[PDB]
């Protein structure tokens, strides 16, 4: 029955996102870290927050944790988010410049008359 | 008390009386 | 069965206007309906209406400009005296400065305003505002 109060959880949620690069996965270091970086009121609460914070380090270590995003996680996501596939991005080259469609889209191209390479495949049903 | 038990009670009462009014008719 | 084609034509227009339609189709569109449309169009409540000649009874497609509030019929066509026009107008119209009570009188279908200056009276057909 050791469920941790949101004041403990939101305190970790107020610590990791700003000090992840300098924290450690060791609780003993963390509570000594919690001494000066965090201005807490009681020693019992000091150890409780350090324990949850250390547990968050393990959870963070094995993949990102939802709801908490440290600073270096932001750049880690954005570099992955700047992906621009240099080919295959609907730039033709599927059949080396002759896109494929059905009869109706083909006539559609003719309803607009635009000059575009094309093809036609049978359907049914 | 349903009105059908009122209905059934009143039917008996309405029909013991056309028998007692018959002894004078 | 139908009893008042003018009532059905006026009701069809009214439902169309409340739905924002800019036109409505009317069947069977008698010539009392046409005369009633003509007075409404003369005062600007509707636009151009066109009579489709089927060989049976007629159709009308009325263009609505959105200026119509409530076109309605008064049934039965009560015999209204020339002095009893004011009573109908007060009961049927929203204000004295606008709206019309269309009367079928011996001089033809006409609004209560024109029928007052021709000094004729008949039976009340319907209203428009």
């Amino acid at each position: 029955g050791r469920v941790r109060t949101k004041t403990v959880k939101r305190a970790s949620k107020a610590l990791i996102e700003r000090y992840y690069p300098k924290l450690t996965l060791d609780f003993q270091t963390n509570k000594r870290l919690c001494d000066e970086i965090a201005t807490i009121q009681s020693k019992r609460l000091r150890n409780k927050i350090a324990g949850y914070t250390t547990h968050l380090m393990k959870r963070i270590q094995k993949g990102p944790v939802r709801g908490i995003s440290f600073k270096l996680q932001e750049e880690e996501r954005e570099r992955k988010d700047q992906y621009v596939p240099e080919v295959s991005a609907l730039d033709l080259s599927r059949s080396n410049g002759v896109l494929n469609v059905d009869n109706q889209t083909s006539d559609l191209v003719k309803s607009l008359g635009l000059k575009l390479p094309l093809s036609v495949i049978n359907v049914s049903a | 008390m349903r009105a059908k038990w009122r209905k059934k009670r009143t039917r008996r009462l309405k029909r013991k009386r056309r028998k007692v009014r018959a002894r004078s008719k | 069965t139908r009893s008042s084609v003018l009532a059905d034509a006026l009701n069809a227009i009214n439902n169309a206007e409340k739905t924002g339609k800019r036109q409505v189709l009317i069947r069977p569109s008698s010539k009392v309906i046409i005369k009633f449309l003509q007075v409404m169009q003369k005062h600007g409540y509707i636009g151009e209406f066109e009579y489709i000649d089927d060989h049976r009874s007629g159709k009308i497609v009325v263009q609505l400009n959105g200026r119509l509030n409530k076109c309605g019929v008064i049934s039965p066509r009560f015999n209204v005296k020339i002095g009893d026009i004011e009573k109908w107008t007060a009961n049927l119209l929203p204000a004295r400065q606008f709206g019309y009570v269309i009367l079928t009188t011996s001089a033809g279908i006409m609004d209560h305003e024109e029928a007052r200056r021709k000094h004729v009276s008949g039976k009340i057909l319907g209203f428009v505002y």
Partner: protein, 81 residues
């Protein structure tokens, strides 16, 4: 659509509707100039016939009534109107 030209419906839209519900109601039925397999005599047969129409030479059958359109007797040429 709240705005449409009820006086000029598209021909595909009117062909979709019931015959009594077009802009001006009319029949979708037609007449056939059926030809007897043997003789050259031309008989004018209603599409929705509903009677077993008979030619002169082919005095057995020329069409067969059904629920709607009449069924031609699988050996007869025809042209509309």
């Amino acid at each position: 659509v709240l705005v449409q030209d009820l006086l000029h419906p598209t021909a595909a839209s009117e062909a979709r509707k019931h015959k009594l519900k077009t802009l001006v109601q009319g029949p979708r039925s037609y007449f056939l100039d059926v030809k007897c397999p043997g003789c050259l005599n031309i008989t004018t047969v209603f599409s929705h016939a509903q009677t077993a129409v008979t030619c002169e030479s082919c005095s057995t059958i020329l069409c067969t009534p059904t629920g709607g359109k009449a069924k031609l007797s699988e050996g007869t040429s025809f042209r509309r109107k």
